[PDB]
Amino acid sequence: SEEKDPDTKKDEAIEIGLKSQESYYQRQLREQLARDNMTVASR
């Protein structure tokens, strides 16, 4: 029963945290790639 699995709310909190970490690493990635793109566009 969708209403009455308490884990639905734990799991939302779990996904939010995973996507948050994932978004952070995706930003570190895009920042590294931005630094590298700018330096390649000048080397």
Binding site: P6, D7, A13, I14, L18, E22, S23, Q28
Partner: protein
């Protein structure tokens, strides 16, 4: 000189007759002050039996049960995604469980002690577990039965050559898996739930995410297999106004849906192309290693704790092509990021990361020592008194744990001893009748009789047409009287008295009126079973065939009191038995001169 296999063990009857030996071959040698061990008042029942039939939970210890539910949930997911040999031999479906009819593998690792019990009195998963526990390694048994090692030094580790990881946290996996209403899609790997006839909101949003990564050619077959159109219409979602997915791993906002595609859907649908910073990716093995490492970066050390040999690196190499179709190897090395290779068993390692991620956001489960799983030390068992050993071997199945060829096995304790093996521990399972442990039934019975203030012995009355039991009490009692025979008269009295009281203690109904037709035959059976010399004189008087019933020795207060005092630990006990069996004794005394 009778045949051998005729003393059936305490273990091969039906329930009613398995109440009879408790009532005739345990209870009359216990004094009313005997304390049953409290651990024995609950018993183990397999979680599957209880999830399908909650009533079976009643005889179990709740805290061991909830723990076992959550633990089995984890163990099953590990085993199911493992490429190694399945320790489970059941399939959890929507609404039901199938026991799989697996070939009987027999090998050098089979328990070298054969099992001579069938356990047909136990619920089917409980029975099934025992068959495995006694034929296989103790390790397998503990894993499938959702055993959790209790806190303390007195929990025995079992020898086995290979073991799965041991995670432990509260979860609802079994309730989700056993959810009855799911789309019966050709792909069984994704159990899309139906709620109010429509695919669930959580699953719909998930599938909508996944759909973005399916090719234009395969989307129709996908949309059909999960009835996406109806779900979209019901959820107001205009499929035509969904955005194009960001297929570039660098600017993709979540890998969740791409990972789900790889986990449940790649083996059935074609994917769109995936890019890294403008370059097309050449290998799905690289895509899955990248996305998992980025999504679960924080859990990689914890994975290495279970799998030390798993490759973890401070960089990854992605083979790509540029738009100009030149092969470009991109080496990605981000500050404070590590990359794990999960190629061996992607499906398992993806699911294992999910278990770890949930564990990090759940509490661990604590449990007490289980008499079924952990038991007692063999010396502790041998230190017990002779009555305790009789009680245990007459109210519980009795098992032992023993080592052979660097593996721990479990077998019936007699058979370990007979095979000249040494038991390390003794494990117990209290048997159940009428929804109670038999141990507890005895405990309650003894307590109740002990608690009775003594009443006067009943006086002789006219026309007593009942023994105070209800219809259902009377019929159970009557069946038991047909089993009572040939015993020494004094003991036969105490056994029948204790049978009546044991029934009377659960007997909710108004007294049952013995039918006139049955009344003489009941009188005969009752006194004959008690070992009284019943004498039925048939005298033909005129046309009438009169039957007169004469019982010897005569039923009197002194005769009964004396007879029970011989068979009782004290005079008080005899008088408390008389007090608890008052209605029956009133009947008997009232019909003795009939």
């Amino acid at each position: 000189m009778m045949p051998i296999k005729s003393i059936v063990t305490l273990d091969q009857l039906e329930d009613s007759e398995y109440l009879f030996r408790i009532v005739s071959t345990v209870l009359p040698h216990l004094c009313l002050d005997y304390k049953v061990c409290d651990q024995l008042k609950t018993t183990f029942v397999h979680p599957f039996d209880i999830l399908l039939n909650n009533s079976l939970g009643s005889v179990t210890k709740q805290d061991e049960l909830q723990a076992a539910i959550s633990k089995l949930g984890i163990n099953y997911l590990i085993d199911t995604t493992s490429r190694e040999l399945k320790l489970f031999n059941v399939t959890l479906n929507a609404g039901n469980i199938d026991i799989i009819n697996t070939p009987i593998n027999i090998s050098s690792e089979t328990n070298p002690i054969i099992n001579t019990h069938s356990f047909y009195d136990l619920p089917p998963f409980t029975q099934h577990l025992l068959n495995i526990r006694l034929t296989d390694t103790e390790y397998r048994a503990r894993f499938i039965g959702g055993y959790i090692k209790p806190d303390g030094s007195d929990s025995m580790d079992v020898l086995a050559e290979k073991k799965y990881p041991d995670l432990n946290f509260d979860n609802t996996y079994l309730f989700n898996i056993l959810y009855k209403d799911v789309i019966n899609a050709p792909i069984k790997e994704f159990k899309a739930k139906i709620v109010n006839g429509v695919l669930s909101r959580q699953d719909f949003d998930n599938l909508i995410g996944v759909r973005q990564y399916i090719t234009i050619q395969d989307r129709p077959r996908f949309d059909d297999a999960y009835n996406i159109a109806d779900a979209a219409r019901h959820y107001g979602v205009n499929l035509n106004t969904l955005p194009l997915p960001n297929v570039d791993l660098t600017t993709m906002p979540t890998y969740k849906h791409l990972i789900m595609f790889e986990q449940y859907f790649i083996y059935t649908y074609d994917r769109v192309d995936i890019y890294y910073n403008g370059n097309k990716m050449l290998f799905d093995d690289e895509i899955i290693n990248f996305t998992i490492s980025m999504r679960y970066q924080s859990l990689i050390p914890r994975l290495v704790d279970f799998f030390p040999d798993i490759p973890v690196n401070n960089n990854i190499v992605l083979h790509t092509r540029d738009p100009q179709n030149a092969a470009v190897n991109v080496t990605v090395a981000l500050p404070n990021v590590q990359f794990v290779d999960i190629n061996r068993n992607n499906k398992f390692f993806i699911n294992f990361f999910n278990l770890l991620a949930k564990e990090q956001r759940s509490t661990a489960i604590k449990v007490t020592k289980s008499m079924f799983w952990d038991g007692m030390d063999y010396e502790e068992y041998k230190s017990k008194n002779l009555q305790d050993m009789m009680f245990i071997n007459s109210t519980c199945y009795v098992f032992g744990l023993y080592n052979h060829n660097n593996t721990t096995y479990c077998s019936i304790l007699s058979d370990i001893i007979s095979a000249e093996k040494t038991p390390i521990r003794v494990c117990l399972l209290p048997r159940v009748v009428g929804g109670k442990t038999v141990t507890n039934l005895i405990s309650e019975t003894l307590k109740s009789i002990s608690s009775m203030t003594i009443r006067e012995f009943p006086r002789k009355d006219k026309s007593i047409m009942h023994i105070g039991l209800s219809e259902t009490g009377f019929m159970r009692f009557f069946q038991l009287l047909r089993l009572m025979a040939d015993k020494p008269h004094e003991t036969a009295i105490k056994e029948v008295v204790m049978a009546y009281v044991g029934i009377k203690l659960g007997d909710k109904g108004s007294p049952y009126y013995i039918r006139k037709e049955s009344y003489q035959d009941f009188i005969y059976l009752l006194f004959a079973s008690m070992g009284f010399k019943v004498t039925t004189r048939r005298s033909i008087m005129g046309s009438n065939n009169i039957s007169i019933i004469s019982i010897r020795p005569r039923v009197t207060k002194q005769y009964i009191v004396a007879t029970l005092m011989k068979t009782s630990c004290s005079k008080n006990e005899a008088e408390k038995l008389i007090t608890s069996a008052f209605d029956l004794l009133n009947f008997m005394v009232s019909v003795s001169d009939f």
